[PDB]
């Protein structure tokens, strides 16, 4: 049964690609968790910021990457593979803008990244990148958009999603959340994201242990909240 799990191109007798599943398991090897919530007029990503050393430059530990002035991404999994996929996505966005004039939709960013991942899955040349990408962007005529891209090459839009070690619990908490109809304001969206992360981690969430990226209809620019804004959101959440 499990003797077919050494080459990504080998189908198991049950029709399962085990190497892709192993990349999915490697997604959790980063040890962190990221949650994305799409509000009525904004999208928000919050990721764990684990700096287990006073010597690290906390500025460069960021897992939030700006793929394009309007499209932001949060990475989960191995850091090197995630950064490689980030540069690939940035190059794809630049190529789209150069070849078609207008800015690439987040739809196409995740679609192209998933296509590259699938090509790596079908041709046994490169090991699949065990990094999950979550892209947020204000796509005109559709509002905010949040998309998730996996090592398998399956890209999907989400009202709210999560990735990392605590993915099932965060997704369950969000599923409990997005069901009770509510005014998904920007503050409400950040509140939902932070509450998801705190509930699944049971952490008091000092402002330096998390990173928040924000895109809004009012300003369709990928913005990373400063520590003061994180503190303000946390104290608003507590009361």
């Amino acid at each position: 049964s499990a003797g077919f799990d050494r080459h990504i191109t080998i189908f198991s007798p049950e029709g399962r690609l085990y190497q892709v599943e192993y990349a999915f398991k490697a997604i959790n090897q980063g040890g962190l968790t990221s949650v994305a919530v799409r509000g009525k007029d904004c999208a928000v990503i919050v990721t764990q910021k684990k700096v287990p050393d006073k010597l690290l430059d906390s500025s460069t530990v960021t897992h939030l990457f700006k793929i394009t002035e309007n499209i932001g991404c949060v990475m989960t999994g191995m850091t090197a593979d995630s950064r490689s996929q980030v540069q690939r996505a940035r190059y794809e966005a630049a190529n789209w803008k150069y070849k078609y004039g207008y800015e690439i939709p987040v739809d196409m960013l995740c679609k192209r990244i998933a296509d590259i991942s699938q090509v790596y899955t079908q041709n046994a040349e490169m090991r699949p990148l065990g990094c999950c990408m979550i892209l947020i962007g204000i796509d005109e005529e559709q509002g905010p958009q949040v998309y998730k891209c996996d090592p398998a090459g399956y890209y999907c839009g989400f009202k709210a999603t999560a990735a990392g070690v605590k993915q099932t619990e965060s997704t369950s908490f969000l599923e409990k959340k997005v069901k009770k109809k509510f005014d998904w304001t920007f503050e409400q969206t950040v509140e939902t994201a932070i509450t998801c992360l705190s509930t699944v981690l049971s952490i008091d969430f000092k402002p330096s242990e998390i990173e928040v990226g924000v895109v809004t209809v009012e300003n369709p620019k990928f913005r990373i909240l400063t520590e003061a804004e994180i503190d303000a959101h946390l104290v608003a959440l507590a009361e």
Binding site: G15, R16, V20, E21, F24, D150, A152, G153, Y154, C156
Partner: protein, 69 residues
């Protein structure tokens, strides 16, 4: 026919569901509903615990990796 059940518990609402479940699944649903009623310290099985147990048992995707489907 052995469980306490209740008047408001209408098994038909669970029979009419189009989900393809087996006799083992039926027994699991009944036992889980009874345990849910017991945990909340209730000697009479209500419809809410039946619905919760049915939803718990019905979920059989687990991961599914969302690309095999």
């Amino acid at each position: 026919s052995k469980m306490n059940l209740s008047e408001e518990v209408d098994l038909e609402d669970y029979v009419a569901r189009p989900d393809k479940i087996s006799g083992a699944d039926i027994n699991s649903i009944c036992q889980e509903s009874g345990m849910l009623a017991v945990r909340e310290n209730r000697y009479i099985v209500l419809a809410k615990d039946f619905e919760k147990a049915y939803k718990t048992v019905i979920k059989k995707d687990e991961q599914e990796h969302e690309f095999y489907k």
